[model samples]
Target: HPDGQYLLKPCLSHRERDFYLHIKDDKEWTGTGIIPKFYGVELHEFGFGELEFIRMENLMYKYKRPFVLDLKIGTQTWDPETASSKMKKRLVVDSTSTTTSLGVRFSGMERNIGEEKPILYSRYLCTHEVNTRDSLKEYIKLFFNDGKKYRKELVPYFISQLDKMIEVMKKREYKMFSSSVLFVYDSTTTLEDKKYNCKMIDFAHNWILSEEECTVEDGFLFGLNNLKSILEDIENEFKSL
Candidate 1:
């Protein structure tokens, strides 16, 4: 059985299970991103009969009415076909699905000329009744408007968070799988508090780059670089307003 505050995931054996247990207390690994803190593992025989499960922090309970978005970072081969398929699959199962689809599409700025380009961009399926915007990309576009309301206070913090995310990825040699990152916008926060946060989830497909792997081009780094570039353009737009 699973506890309310912790998630119970089954493991094949102790060897596979102990890897997470070993690093659960290590701040270096945990500090890389908003990783769900691990508790421990338990073997239960209530009804299922001898089931081993690993316990980890439940992120859903941490933030208040969190509006979450699953994102893929890079643009290497991020074509319309792949994006369309992903959007379709998510929208089909999404309980909040209405007359419109539940996908977010945004434009990327060309580095040199600073022109806009089209970048058409879940999981353990957590559904909440909280109000939601189109996507994280759509929510960010609200600040770019000429209203000049959140330009000073919100824009800077948004860019800083993205900067911190990119820095951590490099420092930790983090490799993010597509559909692994989660953007949680805690709407409960007042304007004074930090509401926007990015978390890297689902490490099952993630890899720590070895010395040799670090030498070659990496998709994770590429995606992050592009994301940084896009945010910089948005920052510039905010400054001009």
Candidate 2:
């Protein structure tokens, strides 16, 4: 059923598939156990290599838990035979599994600041990696120390910087189609951090097909509908909270 339009599927390169499959198998997790779970993969006439849409599950829960998820574009080698054995060792150590241990101590220390009592407000524990430099470590330090600033000021300022970078990137009109969101559990709060306080649960990298790429209408609509549902549900949940 072609409505005078062409359809394109997303595909993963051989190397990419190998890396993903290896990670899944070694970790003994399905990595989001759903069929067509890998979803779409295909090559396009536009000359971009195979693109893939890796499907993931929603792991949101009612109870607030401390966890973190970081996404980045890089090579991960699970085999020891690889030349970058040290890097591989580091990657495995920082596996970011749902059940792994996140060795960090967190204590709530900012309950009282500026002559004001801090009420327990639900914060959006989201982290976005920006271009230019690796400041995540520094940023986390600033957040925990609240050294030269307050939590209220720090959170919004961080997000605003990220938003500004996003706007700039979009304006540049590069082939920018991928972004990662990190969910973290802040332990250095005025409260107590638990043993299973943190875990990084989600990891994904997707290559998309634009209309300019001439993707099929039915497939496009299907993806769009799912995206809409997720967005709407997120919005509703935020409002409810």
Candidate 3:
């Protein structure tokens, strides 16, 4: 457990507590990917009595007021109702235009380009705004010669990072019980040096499968492969410029 800062997550019962404890001692589980490091659980006293809660590494702790986004990727049940509801509660009346929906909207590329077709990426599950920084969905728009200033150096870097993430998932034989693979990102390092990092979060629906099960179709990989192809297309488009 890293010291100084923490993220407090309420626990319902021992089931959730056991989940964290199991993953805590298992380096194989924690080191498999960008899963945040889990510390330990503590009982905290509230108004009436004490409740159980787990502590986690706060990713934003090191950054200087970093811009963050909580993304849910996958296509099983690709509805943003839950995400939208959360955003609605967080939305400010003045920023209605920006917070209209949970998903990011790209202005151009309504038509097909080469063999690739347009895609509407899902909205982030969390709602927050920053004067700077862009989500993966928003960043893709810059590659299409959208009026936004393009950062050519970051394109290949992001693709390489995604490649590494996919490789890690394959190496670990990771399985997704549900279509949703939650990811979180911060622009502190990326905006500083054009190097971005994305971490996987919410493993409640994920599983590490046996070798035999690895042969089965993987929905997580399917979604990532689609994303890779889109990024490849974006890279190619920018290269021709």
Candidate 4:
């Protein structure tokens, strides 16, 4: 795990592997650079025990100390396949967070501050606080800040990448529920001297629709645009100085 060349995720189903297959098959999708590099699957029986895992590229591999941030990208975080009771409970929780109103929710941040005894930020910890524009701005600022100074330079970089992903996503027929944007950057060095990755990582709840179904994932599209705009505001106002 220290090598960071790869990471393994507990394989929940074949659908995720199928999604990766579709992404790999598409030239346009590959060109967007938003999808993680899929490295096939494995069923390990030791150390981690007997379980299926999806081995994929480690987006944080290059960083000395990676700060990982997860933000769920959609208005409705669940699909129709979800149970009615589960949907009701999720709706209640979603409304309480930025999930319902903003189409994005500050899921969590962990093992990012330091080694061994790492500090953590739970989604529930700041759920109610990050609901408004002014408040969410602080959270973004804090994510990029180094305590000594903020890496505001990364604001534009992430926005440009998100825009590139959006252009590709808008053309596809997909219903990406419960998917999240993974933001990984290193605080050890600045974006000016290094690189970072912002990618879509979860595919469990996504649905690849037929062209005739005639639709785009507007819930995520709209949410993605707003997330970009928030960063735009930061670039112009908070980071400009």
Say which candidate scores most in TM-score.
Answer: 4
What ordering of candidates by TM-score runs from best to worst? 4, 3, 1, 2
Pairs in clash, predicted candidate 1: none
Error of 2 at 27 (Å): 4.1
Higher-scoring candidate on TM-score, 1 or 3: 3
TM-score of each: 0.53, 0.24, 0.53, 0.87
| Residue pairs whose backbone atoms clash in candidate 3 | 102-123, 103-123
Candidate 3 root-mean-square deviation in Å: 11.1
Relative to the true structure, how large is the alpha-carbon lDDT of every model?
0.46, 0.29, 0.46, 0.74
Local accuracy of candidate 1 as per-residue lDDT tens digits, 7-72:
777765554365567567767557644455777888877585788877776665544434444544
Put down candidate 3 lDDT per residue, 42-144, tens digits, no spaces.
8899789998888887765654323233333332322222266554443432133122232222212221222233332324322233211244444454333
TM-score of 1: 0.53
In TM-score terms, candidate 3 sits at 0.53
- Please count the clashing residue pairs in each candidate, in the order shown: 0, 12, 2, 0
Question: Between 3 and 4, whose lDDT is larger?
Answer: 4
* Total residue pair clashes for candidate 3: 2
* Best candidate, lDDT: 4
Candidate 4 C-alpha RMSD relative to the actual structure: 3.2
